[PDB]
Scaffold this active site. Structure first.
Site, PDB file in Angstrom:
ATOM      1  N   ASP A 122      -7.798  -7.863  -0.296  1.00  0.00           N
ATOM      2  CA  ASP A 122      -6.680  -7.955   0.693  1.00  0.00           C
ATOM      3  C   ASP A 122      -7.683  -7.696   2.166  1.00  0.00           C
ATOM      4  O   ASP A 122      -8.526  -6.749   2.137  1.00  0.00           O
ATOM      5  CB  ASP A 122      -5.508  -6.890   1.079  1.00  0.00           C
ATOM      6  CG  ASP A 122      -5.886  -5.627   1.512  1.00  0.00           C
ATOM      7  OD1 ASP A 122      -6.375  -4.736   0.392  1.00  0.00           O
ATOM      8  OD2 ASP A 122      -5.816  -5.178   2.428  1.00  0.00           O
ATOM      9  N   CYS A 152     -12.401 -28.659   6.227  1.00  0.00           N
ATOM     10  CA  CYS A 152     -11.362 -27.951   5.664  1.00  0.00           C
ATOM     11  C   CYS A 152     -10.241 -28.641   5.486  1.00  0.00           C
ATOM     12  O   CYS A 152     -10.064 -30.006   6.311  1.00  0.00           O
ATOM     13  CB  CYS A 152     -11.027 -26.805   6.828  1.00  0.00           C
ATOM     14  SG  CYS A 152      -9.452 -25.998   6.660  1.00  0.00           S
ATOM     15  N   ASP A 197       0.936  -1.251  -0.124  1.00  0.00           N
ATOM     16  CA  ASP A 197       0.073  -0.071  -0.160  1.00  0.00           C
ATOM     17  C   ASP A 197       0.860   1.311  -0.187  1.00  0.00           C
ATOM     18  O   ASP A 197       2.070   1.340  -0.010  1.00  0.00           O
ATOM     19  CB  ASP A 197      -1.104   0.010   1.203  1.00  0.00           C
ATOM     20  CG  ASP A 197      -0.340  -0.148   2.404  1.00  0.00           C
ATOM     21  OD1 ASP A 197       0.861   0.396   2.711  1.00  0.00           O
ATOM     22  OD2 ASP A 197      -1.187  -0.567   3.456  1.00  0.00           O
ATOM     23  N   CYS A 237      -6.908 -27.929   5.784  1.00  0.00           N
ATOM     24  CA  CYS A 237      -5.698 -27.412   6.137  1.00  0.00           C
ATOM     25  C   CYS A 237      -4.937 -28.268   7.194  1.00  0.00           C
ATOM     26  O   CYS A 237      -5.731 -29.202   7.750  1.00  0.00           O
ATOM     27  CB  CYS A 237      -6.102 -25.979   6.893  1.00  0.00           C
ATOM     28  SG  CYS A 237      -6.358 -25.768   8.465  1.00  0.00           S
ATOM     29  N   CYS A 244      -6.863 -28.395  10.758  1.00  0.00           N
ATOM     30  CA  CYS A 244      -7.972 -29.234  10.895  1.00  0.00           C
ATOM     31  C   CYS A 244      -7.597 -30.616  11.044  1.00  0.00           C
ATOM     32  O   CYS A 244      -8.504 -31.674  10.997  1.00  0.00           O
ATOM     33  CB  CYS A 244      -9.029 -28.681   9.971  1.00  0.00           C
ATOM     34  SG  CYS A 244      -9.555 -26.991  10.358  1.00  0.00           S
ATOM     35  N   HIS A 281      -5.429 -21.681  10.061  1.00  0.00           N
ATOM     36  CA  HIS A 281      -6.871 -22.193   9.614  1.00  0.00           C
ATOM     37  C   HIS A 281      -7.622 -20.879   8.901  1.00  0.00           C
ATOM     38  O   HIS A 281      -8.033 -21.373   7.809  1.00  0.00           O
ATOM     39  CB  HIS A 281      -7.813 -22.783  10.892  1.00  0.00           C
ATOM     40  CG  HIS A 281      -9.059 -22.891  10.117  1.00  0.00           C
ATOM     41  ND1 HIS A 281      -9.308 -23.723   9.410  1.00  0.00           N
ATOM     42  CD2 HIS A 281     -10.104 -21.919  10.375  1.00  0.00           C
ATOM     43  CE1 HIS A 281     -10.719 -23.592   9.339  1.00  0.00           C
ATOM     44  NE2 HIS A 281     -11.218 -22.628   9.693  1.00  0.00           N
TER      45      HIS A 281
END
Ligand SMILES: CNCc1ccc(Oc2cccnc2)o1
Ligand SMILES: CNCc1ccc(Oc2cccnc2)o1
Ligand SMILES: [Zn+2]
Ligand SMILES: [Zn+2]
Lengths: 368, 368
Positions: free
Chosen positions: A265, A303, A92, A305, A308, A334
């Protein structure tokens, strides 16, 4: 590898899916960028950020310029080398955090860390982003508060367009930056269609590699945000990426993609993860709630990931209640993985011509 | 897999190297145990703890019994399942933290978290450690402050020996615990050789799988600690592990191994890592010091850990100064890896008959 090539592979309505090819890698769109504040995506090693599926992260210029300083980062080899992330980074401009003495030249401010005095201008913002070595550079603009009168929204939009031209010229004057990075312009105009059109026309006349819709997600609420996107996104060049800054919740993202946004974002997955909010396909949960103290299921039972696959709600509940660092690590991994899995589902459904159905099915379950 | 088998592979002077074989794995000795407080080694996933080379971790009974509670952990499948560490765990008795109404039956205390009232006794401590499912269980004793009069040291040692017998009988009365876990006794007697001998004789008469030297590292200083170890360790059964609790700095560990100690735990690498102290082969450094702000070398230029392959002192300096979680993660991983690399060097040098030389070379460089 080209400096910048956006290719649209498939469309459905206003939604698009494709790729941005850059020297440091390919960005799949629609894309979600984890926010990497002061040279770290909080509580995650870069390899973990990548393992979640992220293709690009955001760095906050305001924070970096205060600590450790942009000159220091450049002396140490640039932001990628310093933090250990070798893929694209968008920075930014620094201007929004200054808001959260002003004149046509820029802004001077006192650091929230020690009261030291700093300056930002179109030219200095581009210089800072050059020193960091970021791949996508944001033009420096003037933010418009919400609500804003038509006169104030007009004056701020106009200044932002003058600053967009200065940003463009500063970036083009830096040979190494212009050859290897990309520059995005920011549309302003508050909620007013005529000013949004004037802003889009000015930015297209200057010419940018991509175009953000600025001035949203500042308190107006989702219905109003969606109404402004309805008319604002079609004003931007169709063949370049459309970036919605600081958005948002999963349902904000889906509806914004339905309106032609390609990039996002937000701090929500990281910040709210550290605070105990986990995203699931059945909506968010607050893991600190006592109902999870003996729940042996993972955060979300579909999920993919690593968190999990390995740990229970009950364990994570305990860690967050105890203020343990590992609680922040696991919740953040997660939530970022959830966000990336959402973006993948969006990309696949657009590529397959079933995104409108996905968005309906997603909302029906998430809000149940 | 046996419940417990300690085998000594090699000796040099009083130092030993070998293995403890248990149902959940093999522990290489001399061993360092990272401290896993409230079901987490702070700032590290269990896979990262293992990647550093640790074979066993310690869990703090006092903290676990208050949050999340031992009964809850048992209901959820035990501590190994809850935190995701499947290798051996040693648990302390809880008694020391209560110190940091008392009678011959045990102690009642108010929780430092909410003032709730709790109780510990030999029997309840063993029961809590059963509920957690730990592999090495510590007998419950009465700690002796330093300095202590001979009379007070004697009375506390005697009570501790009565509590050691009660701990033994409680453990033996729990079929599943006695068949699958090991029980360690703790020698007391402050700095007094006669009381240390009486304590060792009582513990050997009761019979334990291993023997800790208690009551040290409580303010007496290294010379005095070493002097007490000189006479105390030879009083313990030679064929069982010798455990020095709450020790220590790298040089404490080396000199304790020279005096016959096989096992150690301490908070130093984790706690001091979060506070900005990194261990190196040339001594500790405080990474927050401004001299590191532009130092591109890793924390230690010979360390094998993943942190030293990937990140600079300058970056870690910034993270710790900024209070970033990743700073704590990286410092902790490095310091635990340093400790494990030290233990490996100790084991190899003993196995090769060159430990006395290693200890001299280590001290000469570490203190330079
Ligand atoms: C009412 N807005 C007029 C308008 C369209 C584009 C711009 O931008 C400008 C024009 C002139 C000077 N500064 C900014 O203004
Ligand atoms: C001066 N200490 C005497 C001694 C040796 C071993 C023990 O331990 C005891 C003996 C009797 C009762 N309680 C503890 O005391
Ligand atoms: Zn997950
Ligand atoms: Zn290291």
């Amino acid at each position: 590898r080209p400096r910048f090539s956006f290719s649209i592979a498939a469309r459905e309505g206003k939604a698009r899916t494709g790729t941005i090819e850059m020297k440091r890698g390919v960005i799949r769109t629609p894309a979600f960028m984890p926010v990497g504040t002061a040279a770290t995506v909080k509580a995650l090693k870069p390899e973990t950020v990548r393992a979640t599926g992220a293709d690009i992260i955001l760095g906050n210029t305001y924070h970096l310029m205060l600590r450790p300083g942009a000159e220091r980062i450049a002396k140490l080899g640039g932001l990628h080398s310093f933090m250990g992330w070798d893929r694209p980074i968008l920075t930014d401009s620094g201007g929004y955090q200054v808001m959260s003495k002003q004149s046509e030249e820029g802004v001077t401010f006192k650091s929230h860390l020690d009261g030291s005095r700093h300056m930002l201008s179109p030219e200095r913002s581009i210089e800072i982003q050059h020193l960091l070595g970021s791949d996508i550079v944001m033009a420096f603009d003037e933010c418009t508060p919400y609500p804003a009168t038509p006169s104030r929204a007009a004056s701020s939009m106009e200044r932002s367009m003058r600053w967009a031209k200065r940003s463009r010229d500063a970036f083009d004057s830096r040979k190494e930056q212009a050859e290897n990075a990309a520059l995005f312009g920011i549309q302003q105009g508050s909620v007013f269609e005529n000013l949004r059109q004037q802003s889009a026309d000015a930015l297209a006349e200057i010419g940018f590699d991509g175009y953000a819709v600025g001035g949203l997600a500042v308190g107006e609420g989702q219905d109003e945000m969606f109404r402004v996107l309805d008319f604002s996104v079609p004003m931007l060049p169709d063949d370049k990426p459309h970036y919605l800054m600081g958005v948002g919740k999963p349902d904000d993202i889906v509806g914004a993609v339905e309106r032609g946004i390609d990039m996002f974002d937000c701090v929500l997955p990281t910040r709210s993860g550290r605070n105990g909010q986990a995203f699931t396909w059945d909506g968010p949960i607050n893991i600190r709630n006592a109902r999870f103290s003996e729940d042996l299921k993972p955060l979300d039972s579909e999920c993919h990931c690593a968190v999990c696959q390995k740990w229970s709600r009950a364990y994570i509940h305990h860690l967050i209640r105890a203020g343990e660092i590992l609680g922040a690590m696991l919740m953040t991994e997660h939530n970022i993985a959830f966000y990336q899995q959402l973006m993948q589902k969006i990309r696949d459904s657009i590529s397959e011509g079933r995104f409108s159905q996905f968005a309906q099915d997603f909302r029906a379950r998430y809000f149940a």
